[PDB]
Structure 1
Amino acid sequence: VNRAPVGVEPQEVHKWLQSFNWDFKENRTKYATKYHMANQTKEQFKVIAKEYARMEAAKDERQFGTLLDGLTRLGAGNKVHPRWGETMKVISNFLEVGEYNAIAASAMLWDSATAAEQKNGYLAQVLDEIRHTHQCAFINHYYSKHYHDPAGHNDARRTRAIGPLWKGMKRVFADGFISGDAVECSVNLQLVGEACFTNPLIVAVTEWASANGDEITPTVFLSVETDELRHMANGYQTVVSIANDPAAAKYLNTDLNNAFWTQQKYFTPALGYLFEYGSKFKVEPWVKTWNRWVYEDWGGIWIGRLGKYGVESPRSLRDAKTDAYWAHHDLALAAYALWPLGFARLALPDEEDQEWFEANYPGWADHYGKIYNEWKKLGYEDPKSGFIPYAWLLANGHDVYIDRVSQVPFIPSLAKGSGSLRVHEFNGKKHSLTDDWGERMWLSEPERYECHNLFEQYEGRELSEVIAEGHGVRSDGKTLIAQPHVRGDNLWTLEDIKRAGCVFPNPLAKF
Structure 2
Amino acid sequence: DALKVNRAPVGVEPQEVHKWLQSFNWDFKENRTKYPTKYHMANETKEQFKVIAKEYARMEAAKDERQFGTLLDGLTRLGAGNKVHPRWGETMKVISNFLEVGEYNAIAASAMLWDSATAAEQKNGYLAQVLDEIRHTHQCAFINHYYSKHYHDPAGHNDARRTRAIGPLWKGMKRVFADGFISGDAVECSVNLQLVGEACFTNPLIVAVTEWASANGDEITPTVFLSVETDELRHMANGYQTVVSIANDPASAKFLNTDLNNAFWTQQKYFTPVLGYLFEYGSKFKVEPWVKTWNRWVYEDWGGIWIGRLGKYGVESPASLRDAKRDAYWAHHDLALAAYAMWPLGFARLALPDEEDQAWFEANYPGWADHYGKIFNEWKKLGYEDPKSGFIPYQWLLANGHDVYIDRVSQVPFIPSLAKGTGSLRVHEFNGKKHSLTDDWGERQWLIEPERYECHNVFEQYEGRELSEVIAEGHGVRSDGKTLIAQPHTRGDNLWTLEDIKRAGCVFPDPLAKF
Instruction: State the alpha-carbon separation in 2 of the partners of residues 192 and 431 from structure 1.
Output: 28
Q: Is the 8 A contact 1:37 1:114 kept in 2?
A: no
Q: Match of 2:239?
A: 235
Instruction: State the alpha-carbon separation in 2 of the partners of residues 114 and 478 from structure 1.
Output: 55
- SS of corresponding position for 1:510: coil
Q: Match of 2:279?
A: 275
- SS of corresponding position for 1:311: coil
Instruction: State the alpha-carbon separation in 1 of the partners of residues 445 and 35 from structure 2.
Output: 22
Change (3 A) 1:479 1:316: same
Structure 1 residue 510, shift from structure 2 partner: 0.9
Q: Is the 8 A contact 1:37 1:113 kept in 2?
A: no
Instruction: State the alpha-carbon separation in 1 of the partners of residues 132 and 456 from structure 2.
Output: 33
Further displaced range: 259-268 or 410-419? 410-419
Deviation track 1:118-159 (CA, whole Å, cap 9, x = no partner) reads 011011101111111111111111100011111111111111
Q: Is the 8 A contact 1:93 1:156 kept in 2?
A: yes
Number of residue-to-residue matches in the alignment? 511
Further displaced range: 301-310 or 184-193? 301-310
Q: Is the 8 A contact 1:179 1:185 kept in 2?
A: no
Q: Match of 1:445?
A: 449
Q: Match of 1:48?
A: 52
Superposition TM-score, scaled by structure 1 size: 0.98
Q: Which runs of 5+ in 1 are unaligned?
A: none
Q: Is the 8 A contact 1:209 1:215 kept in 2?
A: yes
Q: Is the 8 A contact 1:420 1:434 kept in 2?
A: yes
Structure 1 residue 238, shift from structure 2 partner: 1.0
- SS of corresponding position for 1:424: strand
Instruction: State the alpha-carbon separation in 2 of the partners of residues 75 and 39 from structure 1.
Output: 51
Structure 1 residue 474, shift from structure 2 partner: 1.0
Structure 1 residue 385, shift from structure 2 partner: 1.5
- SS of corresponding position for 1:485: coil
Instruction: State the alpha-carbon separation in 1 of the partners of residues 479 and 8 from structure 2.
Output: 68
Change (3 A) 1:257 1:39: closer
Deviation track 1:5-60 (CA, whole Å, cap 9, x = no partner) reads 22211222111122111111222211111212425311111111111111111111
- SS of corresponding position for 2:59: helix
Q: Is the 8 A contact 2:270 2:412 kept in 1?
A: yes
Task: Select which of 42, 45, 67 maps to 1:38.
Answer: 42
Q: Which runs of 5+ in 2 are unaligned?
A: none
Q: Is the 8 A contact 2:246 2:256 kept in 1?
A: no
Deviation track 1:186-243 (CA, whole Å, cap 9, x = no partner) reads 2110100010000111222110111111111111110001010111110111111233
Q: Is the 8 A contact 1:337 1:388 kept in 2?
A: yes
Change (3 A) 1:39 1:174: closer
Deviation track 1:265-297 (CA, whole Å, cap 9, x = no partner) reads 000000100000011111110011110111110
Structure 1 residue 263, shift from structure 2 partner: 0.4
Deviation track 1:426-462 (CA, whole Å, cap 9, x = no partner) reads 1111111111111111111111111111101001111
Instruction: State the alpha-carbon separation in 2 of the partners of residues 410 and 154 from structure 1.
Output: 30
Superposition TM-score, scaled by structure 2 size: 0.98
Structure 1 residue 475, shift from structure 2 partner: 1.0
Deviation track 1:360-389 (CA, whole Å, cap 9, x = no partner) reads 111111111111111111111111121111
Q: Is the 8 A contact 1:461 1:504 kept in 2?
A: yes
Q: Is the 8 A contact 1:357 1:364 kept in 2?
A: yes
Q: Is the 8 A contact 2:100 2:140 kept in 1?
A: yes
Further displaced range: 151-160 or 34-43? 34-43
Instruction: State the alpha-carbon separation in 1 of the partners of residues 225 and 137 from structure 2.
Output: 11
Q: Is the 8 A contact 2:43 2:117 kept in 1?
A: no
Q: Is the 8 A contact 1:176 1:185 kept in 2?
A: no
Further displaced range: 70-79 or 244-253? 244-253
Q: Is the 8 A contact 2:246 2:253 kept in 1?
A: no
Change (3 A) 1:39 1:383: closer
Instruction: State the alpha-carbon separation in 1 of the partners of residues 228 and 177 from structure 2.
Output: 17
- SS of corresponding position for 2:8: coil
Structure 1 residue 407, shift from structure 2 partner: 0.7
Q: Match of 1:147?
A: 151
Further displaced range: 242-251 or 173-182? 242-251
Instruction: State the alpha-carbon separation in 1 of the partners of residues 271 and 415 from structure 2.
Output: 18
Structure 1 residue 344, shift from structure 2 partner: 0.5
Further displaced range: 21-30 or 296-305? 21-30
- SS of corresponding position for 2:427: strand
Structure 1 residue 3, shift from structure 2 partner: 2.3
Deviation track 1:94-140 (CA, whole Å, cap 9, x = no partner) reads 11111010000011110111111001101110111111111111111
- SS of corresponding position for 2:195: helix
Q: Is the 8 A contact 2:41 2:252 kept in 1?
A: no
Instruction: State the alpha-carbon separation in 1 of the partners of residues 15 and 409 from structure 2.
Output: 47
- SS of corresponding position for 2:183: coil
Task: Select which of 337, 357, 360 maps to 1:356.
Answer: 360
Structure 1 residue 2, shift from structure 2 partner: 2.4
In the alignment, does 2:61 pair up with 1:57?
yes
Q: Is the 8 A contact 2:247 2:256 kept in 1?
A: no
Further displaced range: 284-293 or 176-185? 176-185
Q: Is the 8 A contact 1:36 1:245 kept in 2?
A: no
Q: Is the 8 A contact 1:348 1:372 kept in 2?
A: yes
Task: Select which of 255, 264, 268 maps to 2:268.
Answer: 264
Q: Is the 8 A contact 1:346 1:483 kept in 2?
A: yes
Instruction: State the alpha-carbon separation in 2 of the partners of residues 290 and 241 from structure 1.
Output: 29
Q: Is the 8 A contact 2:190 2:240 kept in 1?
A: no
Deviation track 1:64-117 (CA, whole Å, cap 9, x = no partner) reads 111111011111112111110000011110111110100000111101111110
Instruction: State the alpha-carbon separation in 2 of the partners of residues 249 and 2 from structure 1.
Output: 54
Among all aligned residue pairs of Structure 1 and Structure 2, give the percentage whose two residues are the same amino acid. 97
Instruction: State the alpha-carbon separation in 1 of the partners of residues 184 and 135 from structure 2.
Output: 26
Q: Is the 8 A contact 1:163 1:342 kept in 2?
A: yes
- SS of corresponding position for 1:447: helix
Q: Is the 8 A contact 2:86 2:490 kept in 1?
A: yes
In the alignment, does 2:151 pair up with 1:121?
no
Instruction: State the alpha-carbon separation in 2 of the partners of residues 386 and 199 from structure 1.
Output: 41
